Amino acid sequence: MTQQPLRGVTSLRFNQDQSCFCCAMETGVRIYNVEPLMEKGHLDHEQVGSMGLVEMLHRSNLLALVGGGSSPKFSEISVLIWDDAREGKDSKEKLVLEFTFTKPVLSVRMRHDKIVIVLKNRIYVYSFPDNPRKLFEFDTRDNPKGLCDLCPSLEKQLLVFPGHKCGSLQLVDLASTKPGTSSAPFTINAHQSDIACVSLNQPGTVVASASQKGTLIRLFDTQSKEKLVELRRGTDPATLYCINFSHDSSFLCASSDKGTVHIFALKDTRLNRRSALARVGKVGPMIGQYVDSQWSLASFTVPAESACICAFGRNTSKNVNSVIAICVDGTFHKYVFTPDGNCNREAFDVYLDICDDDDF
């Protein structure tokens, strides 16, 4: 049963610096600034039809578009590049490039010099925007969610996706890889079940991942491959929708099908809650892994039936950090949190009911 898209939202994505988000819909595409929450432009159904995927390149005029939903103008096997800064009387003049594949596109990732196209069992990497050429192609395990993350750093060209072994990650340095050569992806055995979420931090020094069990989030150093931390979202299984780092890598947020967004401290891990059993010192040989688990510093609730992406906002002050949740039901949630674990709603809006203020 494909859940009918709540309010017609088919996909949600933050841009690379989490400062904008894009919304693919049954009625086209919408682009929002996160702080302040404001519509920055849309593509209507008359321009693009129903859309399955949208990815924005940073804060530029370049969008990668994949047709999908109930009434698409474009194929689910084509990635179209829209250039919104092009003057043209016809919407077709803003379509600057097309990448066509033999299977449906499940995710697109962009950075300043590259576009990455994810199919169910293959990942393609091209140079972008100028004179696009295929640089690399990678085989994957069954990747039906298009799971891939691409480091946005100028200094590191790290790609991460699900590896061939169940619950493994493959990491590829695209700068160290000669074009047309297989630089061997290095493998991290992150989980025992299939990967559900993966994210890199901004410098590409740390990878976070969660499996389909969604009880644990594991962080690894991307160079040494060592497990840095194991975070516990909950006791109970949960489908994670999103995991993201803060810009400074001090925190990690995680959204799930429990209607909860969890916040973890990564830099000062003492801010994370620990099980009370960790204070009842080492009574017996079998409780060791539950005692060392770090629980969320803070958490807040969102509508439980609404899938949501989560990210960090801009630091408003020296000790107050913000987390945004964008939900497929059209709701925007902003929470402020502090190192003592207080977490309070700062803003709530219905981002789909934000019209362009054609009044000023």
Added chain:
Amino acid sequence: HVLMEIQLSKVSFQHEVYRPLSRQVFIVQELEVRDRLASSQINKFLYSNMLTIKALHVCCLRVSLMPLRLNVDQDALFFLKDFFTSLVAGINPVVPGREFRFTSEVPIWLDTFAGLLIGLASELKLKRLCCRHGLLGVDKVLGYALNEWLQD
């Protein structure tokens, strides 16, 4: 007398077809200006192709983004100017001597505006006059004169 081939294939000027009032779409499937000046042989001058130069409504325009539009190196590009002079000599009365978005919408592969084209004979760019409204039926030249542009 002159010989200068010009073609306009499948110009589906379905005036008042619908665009609500007199869509009158030029919808020019091909507007290749085959020749001008003294040259009768076809050489691609411009204003499948779908060059809806005058796709209208009620007030609009467009362009077909052909790979090369203005290849003016044949005989005299001002030979059509002297043709217009002989026209006003023959046609004694010559009076004409939403937002438009009247784009030129073609990455012009070019090769007095005619003098500069002759001297230069890619080399120009499409205006992309989104909602410019620089034209007013007599102010088309005014809208063309907006800002400045040059390339190569």
